[PDB]
Amino acid sequence: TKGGTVKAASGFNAMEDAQTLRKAMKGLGTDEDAIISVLAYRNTAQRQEIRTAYKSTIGRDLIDDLKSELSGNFEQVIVGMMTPTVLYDVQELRRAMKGAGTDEGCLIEILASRTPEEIRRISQTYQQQYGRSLEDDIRSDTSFMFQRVLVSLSAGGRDEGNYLDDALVRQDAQDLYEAGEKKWGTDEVKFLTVLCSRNRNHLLHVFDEYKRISQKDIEQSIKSETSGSFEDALLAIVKCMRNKSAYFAEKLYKSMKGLGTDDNTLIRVMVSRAEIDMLDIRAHFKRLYGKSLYSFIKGDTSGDYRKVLLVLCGGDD
């Protein structure tokens, strides 16, 4: 409701911007500040217009030049900024599943937080780019109840609109309560059904009703009654249903708090949310953690990487 930090620029001149970028890179060394000064002050759509103008008017490829001139985390953020929105998510999902390891955290983050419509575009573009089914790769790289949550999210079939069937709210809450009170293991299918099928308004009512009948928040019961990546997936859905900006604020906190930094998560969240809800993220971060997002980034990063992340954040002195 406050929205993004990065906006479309006024006075946008793609041919000038292309020349600025060329001048920043031509010759020994690089003017990284000049690169930030353009790209962090244009939206993703405008950055694509710059790519086109750079090819047409400089006779070179902008992404290729950026990759040649930049390195490390700064390169990763800049090239991420230059990637069309859908394709960036596609590429992050592919990276999460490629080869031996599986980045379950990334799969959860994207699939829980994106809308069905966004996930349709992701699914189709993944197929077109790689000639692999996103669903098939999920089913190859994850298993059991966690897999079922990711498959459901990947299919985009959740109920929509805000219809309030209060009897079904009451039955859902009661079902979730009884699913936790079973003697020999939680009925995890009830959690899957309710949290993957029902509309948002419905779920917000279920959360409040569950608290009324159990005296526990649904997150408390998820934590005590489930485990592993399935637990994490359920919690992400709950958090996203309550407030997506708060979900992202927590991801940013966790990426930076204590020793070192989860740069892959910090980068993906800052790049993906800068134009959507970064101002809301900042507000929720401050409420949750009693410190500014800006100050966290400034204390955890350095160099040109810090500079660009602080423009994406906005703020603060």
Q: How far is the CB of 251 from Ca ion (least distance, A)?
A: 14
Q: Which amino acid is at 26?
A: K
Residue that is written with structure tokens 């079973």 in the block: 182
Total residues contacting Ca ion by CB under 5 A comes to 6
Q: Quick check: 202 and 237 in contact, CB under 8 A?
A: no
316 preceded by a cis bond (ω within 30 of 0): yes
**Burial classification of residue 11, based on how many CB atoms lie within 10 Å of its CB (0-12 exposed, 13-18 middle, 19 or more buried):** exposed
Identify the DSSP state of 189: H
DSSP 78-145: HHHHHS-HHHHHHHHHHHHHSSS---HHHHHHHHHHS-HHHHHHHHHHHHHHHSS-HHHHHHHH--HH
CB closer to Ca ion, 143 vs 243: 143
Among the listed ranges 152-160, 173-181, 199-207, 295-303, the one in contact with Ca ion (CB under 5 A) is: 295-303
- The count of other CB atoms within 10 Å of the CB of residue 46 is 19
Q: Which ranges constitute the DSSP H helices of 114-227?
A: 116-130, 134-141, 144-155, 166-180, 188-197, 200-214, 218-225
Residue 116 CA to residue 110 CA, distance in Å, equals 11
Q: How far is the CB of 35 from Ca ion (least distance, A)?
A: 11
Q: Quick check: 82 and 39 in contact, CB under 8 A?
A: yes
Question: Is position 31 an interface residue for Ca ion (rule: CB under 5 A)?
Answer: no
Q: How far is the CB of 104 from Ca ion (least distance, A)?
A: 10
CB closer to Ca ion, 102 vs 295: 102
CB closer to Ca ion, 26 vs 200: 26
Q: How far is the CB of 261 from Ca ion (least distance, A)?
A: 5
Find the binder of Ca ion among 31, 75, 103, 141 (CB under 5 A). Answer: 141
Alpha carbon separation from 158 to 116, 161, 194, 203 (Å, rounded): 8, 10, 10, 11
Residue number closest to Ca ion, CB atom: 102
CB closer to Ca ion, 107 vs 206: 107
Question: Is position 219 an interface residue for Ca ion (rule: CB under 5 A)?
Answer: no
Binding mask 236-265 for Ca ion (x = CB under 5 A): --------------------x---------
- The count of other CB atoms within 10 Å of the CB of residue 168 is 16
Site for Ca ion in 63-122 (CB under 5 A): 97, 102
CB closer to Ca ion, 70 vs 153: 70
Binding mask 142-181 for Ca ion (x = CB under 5 A): ----------------------------------------
Q: How far is the CB of 93 from Ca ion (least distance, A)?
A: 11
Question: Is position 300 an interface residue for Ca ion (rule: CB under 5 A)?
Answer: yes
Binding site for Ca ion (CB under 5 A): 25, 97, 102, 141, 256, 300
